[PDB]
Design a protein around this ligand. Structure first.
Ligand SMILES: [Ca+2]
Ligand SMILES: [Ca+2]
Ligand SMILES: [Ca+2]
Ligand SMILES: [Ca+2]
Ligand SMILES: [Cu+2]
Length: 316
């Protein structure tokens, strides 16, 4: 909408108070004009029609329970923008300040959240398996990262290219969680998964096995469900990403970690300059190595760690 930029205040899903960029024209809208061509958050009103209606509020205060998922969807979309801009010099997901639009309250009891090719969509969860999923900054940054993948490598959402796609989203979602520096970790979704149970998550990057996902190529899922295990085989790449950053010994293979910034730089470069829609695991290895080579030289520690990490998970 046309109006003037202002700042509202509210509480997100986990009861935390934050300021949000809004726009005033009769009502206060969840429209942030300070980032790119804008960040826009909508109410799907428990239906599945999208995007629904631009979020409008009478007093610029967002403290109702109904408001909380919108507050976080909006705020975290902004933190993700900031991550990509400040860290990778990328402006929004298309690199040209594309508007970011999010819908919350999608359907009833919907235990998931997703980028749909045009915008972000967040269910409220059923209150047992999940609380409103925009409560999880890694969840938000994960799904927004599929937009970045759509506009760069274009990794097809199936089999190994699909698990790479997933892995990439897990990797930048986590790096965004670390950048926000709020109880960061290498698990995915812990802030909104199973409010009844402490310390679990959807999956783990540091030890995928913890939730049944493979941590070695030999343990790869080979069937046809989950689009050829895209959310399963990502464990293999996630493990590799984790070892490159934090290092470790895995199946008797030892990796010297080089830290999160370099991991980010190496995988951002691999994603935007070397991966393709049908890249497989082996190709990702060649892409991460070449990226590290571009960045630190063929005989650097960075390249050696990349080589060791993929060896440790069995990806030659
Ligand atoms: Ca209000
Ligand atoms: Ca966390
Ligand atoms: Ca996390
Ligand atoms: Ca839990
Ligand atoms: Cu995903």
């Amino acid at each position: 909408i046309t109006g003037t930029s202002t700042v509202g205040v509210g509480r997100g899903v986990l009861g935390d108070q934050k300021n949000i960029n809004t726009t005033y024209s009769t009502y206060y809208y969840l429209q942030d004009n300070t980032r790119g061509n804008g960040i826009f958050t909508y109410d799907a009103k428990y239906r599945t029609t999208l995007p629904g209606s631009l979020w409008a509020d009478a007093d610029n205060q967002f403290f109702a329970s109904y408001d909380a998922p919108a507050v976080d969807a909006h705020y975290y979309a902004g933190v993700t923008y900031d991550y990509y801009k400040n860290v990778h010099n990328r402006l929004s997901y298309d690199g040209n300040n594309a508007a970011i639009r999010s819908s919350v309250h999608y359907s009833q009891g919907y235990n998931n959240a997703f980028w749909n090719g045009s915008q972000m969509v967040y269910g409220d969860g059923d209150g047992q398996t999940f609380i409103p999923l925009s409560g999880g900054i890694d969840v938000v940054a994960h799904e927004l990262t599929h937009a970045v993948t759509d506009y760069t490598a274009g990794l097809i959402y199936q089999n190994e290219s699909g698990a790479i796609n997933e892995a990439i989203s897990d990797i930048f979602g986590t790096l965004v969680e670390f950048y926000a520096n709020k109880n960061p970790d290498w698990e995915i979704g812990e802030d909104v998964y199973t409010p009844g149970i402490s310390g679990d998550s959807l999956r783990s990057m540091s030890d995928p096995a913890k939730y049944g996902d493979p941590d070695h190529y030999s343990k790869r899922y080979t069937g046809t469900q989950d689009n050829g295990g895209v959310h399963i085989n990502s464990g293999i790449i996630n493990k590799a990403a984790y070892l490159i950053s934090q290092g470790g010994t895995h199946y008797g293979v030892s990796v010297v970690g080089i830290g999160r910034d370099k991991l980010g730089k190496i995988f951002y470069r691999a994603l935007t300059q070397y991966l393709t829609p049908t890249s497989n695991f082996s190709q990702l290895r060649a892409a991460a190595v070449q990226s590290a080579t571009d960045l630190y030289g063929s005989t650097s520690q960075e390249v050696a760690s990349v080589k060791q990490a993929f060896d440790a998970v069995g990806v030659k």
